[PDB]
Amino acid sequence: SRRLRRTKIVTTLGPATDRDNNLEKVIAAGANVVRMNFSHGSPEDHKMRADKVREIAAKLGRHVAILGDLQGPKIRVSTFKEGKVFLNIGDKFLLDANLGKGEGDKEKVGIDYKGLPADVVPGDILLLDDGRVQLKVLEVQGMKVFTEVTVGGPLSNNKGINKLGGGLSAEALTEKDKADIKTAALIGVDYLAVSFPRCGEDLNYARRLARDAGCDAKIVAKVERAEAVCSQDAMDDIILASDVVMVARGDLGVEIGDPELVGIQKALIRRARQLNRAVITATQMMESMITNPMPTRAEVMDVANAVLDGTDAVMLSAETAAGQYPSETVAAMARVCLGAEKIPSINVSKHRLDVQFDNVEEAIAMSAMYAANHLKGVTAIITMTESGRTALMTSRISSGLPIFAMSRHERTLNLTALYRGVTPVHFDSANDGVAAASEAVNLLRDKGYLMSGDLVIVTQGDVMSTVGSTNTTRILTVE
Amino acid sequence: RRLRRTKIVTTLGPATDRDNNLEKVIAAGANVVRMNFSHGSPEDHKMRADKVREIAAKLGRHVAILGDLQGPKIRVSTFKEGKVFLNIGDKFLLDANLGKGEGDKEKVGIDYKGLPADVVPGDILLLDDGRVQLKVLEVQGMKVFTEVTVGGPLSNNKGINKLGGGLSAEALTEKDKADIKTAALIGVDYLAVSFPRCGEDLNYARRLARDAGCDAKIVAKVERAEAVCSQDAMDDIILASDVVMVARGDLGVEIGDPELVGIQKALIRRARQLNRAVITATQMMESMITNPMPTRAEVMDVANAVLDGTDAVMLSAETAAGQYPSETVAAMARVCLGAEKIPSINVSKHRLDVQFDNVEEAIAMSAMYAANHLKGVTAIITMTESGRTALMTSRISSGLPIFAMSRHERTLNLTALYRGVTPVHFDSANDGVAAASEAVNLLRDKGYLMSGDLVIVTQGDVMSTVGSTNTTRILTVE
């Protein structure tokens, strides 16, 4: 009975995590979900990493989900010779769909996204590398787009382009994405994230490609486009077509304003939890730790306010994939989460006043959380669920308490590793009813989670039938 | 045009004297300039005060001046050369006798001669915001033997903190006493007291200012574990203060950067509950000392302090010593405006269950209740010669602008700190509804209000020399 971190940590893999024994150290420091970024590496790199993740998990007795993250369309500026100059005034600058590796410097670079000329009209603003360069388009002729500076700076190889506001029509699933879905299906990823989705139909397309390959992974919608957050209908359309919502702040904040991002993040987290979906807060939470062994105060406050906003999880990218302190960044991130979770605000719920359920399992989950949060002496909620679904519904409700999700399936335990406050715990008993319940309570005891006097809320499916699911709460005393 | 409500406090220094940067930072929207007595001579601050009042009279703006005492210098003194060190169990020593004798081989001087009797075997000293650490082994006489544990570079004059509370240094130094006299000569609007353990410290500073002829409003820098250890300690500090400053630098290093979020939030809420203003302080956009754009985490930090309900957000080096002082101010402003649209920070419970025993506070509260719930209201106008109704009304979350109408320059500069408050000079010689409508028409003629608009006005209307604000008016423009 030590306080358990509730907020979950997603960590991208890469060179920094293959080198030495770092992957193992980042799992030990507390990673719950490992992210494979298909933007880099080859299928054999990702497959080899998947084997070493599962082996390390087996050895450490940890439950670690695998997330596969699709690249989506490369809307970048391609490559020069290596003269990354660009000035500040009103120089002209060309973007030419037809151009290979001619140095920018002047007014020329190629575009990987051939379709940009159809998508921009004079007076549109293109932000390059998150806005550290900007350009105003004067004219579009054929596959050439003639822009002027506005703001300036350094312009390196393959840096991204975002249109201010929505606008581009590049298709979400690139051919590389279809191949990579086949790879994530072979690896058997637990979650599969779709870049640049326009609406929910893009997500349905990716989910079917995954199905046709044999993979029923849960879909993470990457919310990176002004088009996804421009109205509550748009936002609901994306979320409902997802199993997990990923709040991807880099591109999304460049398109709409960086100030308007804070409202939008809070709104997406709140809506995801209302629709019984989990949510990741992502990009580069603790950027400064690519380089330095300690976070920025601002980075701490960022992570902590994501925690207080209701996020299931927070994500590291280059910090763990390419940085100097992979396990250290995890350790720090975990400390920030533990800190922020003490704040009374994120411990209390209204318990969905004015919400009506039409689902017995959700009723059980909601009334168990209500009992749990208000009964003196409760120290844990236990969800015996082979699908994980009770754990998802209970974790939608804020609380200081740990939720223990008991299942016999590796896929369910891995799955639940992403959920807020959920500790997946392997359980395979042959008992049912109160015997299974008490055997789970005593297993949790033997592991250190419960003490001999505690009260525990238990949710279970008990019926004389093959029809139906979780329909039972028990309030038991340990030992 | 929708107006910014969160105020911006900008520290002065080399980068503000240079070129015409002071005026630029004022034009971009600085509402309070901060003179940091840790650096510079008294004549530098006197010069800058003249320059700020010149620029503000020029631009028709009201800019408050805040003076920030240095407090005790708990630092590492200096050494010949020694800006580097390794440590996986290495020994280090602090000895209070030393002027400039080498870091490495475990020696440096302490400027706070009282550190050895405050550390006890097992204590950790975090140096340079914890970038180096030390665990204390032994202390004999005025020497303190430690081992290094966490390490790195140790430059000149870097600070020391004890993990948790502990240190017993006096809050008001002799330098602080000299500088309280300088701040009195300048005539600062706000005066910030470093390292206060309890309200008594603030009371000492305030008497020193009083003896010097200075009635500045006192700003408690909350930098110490001892100040947030309990709700009683926190109230003791806040009640002795006029303004609360969440000084995240030292306090974070003392209680742990994680605990700092909830402490900041607590401190802001309690400040506002007790009818004081609050400033979230130090290095809010650190990145822009060097880079022309802020870090996304800095934007997140800033906007969440807005949502937390701060009166003001503060820039240090960004404006005193950086390359982009006016541009940092403008970035900070855009973030503030963006964050202020979030419904969260626009809406109030209007102090359910709270009872007033002050007519003026009740007038301010019913004023804001009306203003926030009457369709077509576009401004609240507090007619107040002290500003006290502006302080009170602005305690209440709203999207609406509060125009604070006084005839006194010190009241307008004072209120420049208050969240959502725009000071406007007004001096009518008419009374009652006359001066009321005169003020409304001034605000319309200045472009602030449109002819259809409804406004809420608070003032004092009574045929007596007894009392203050006691009236609310809901008027229609033109």
Ligand SMILES: [Mg+2]
């Ligand atoms: Mg699969």
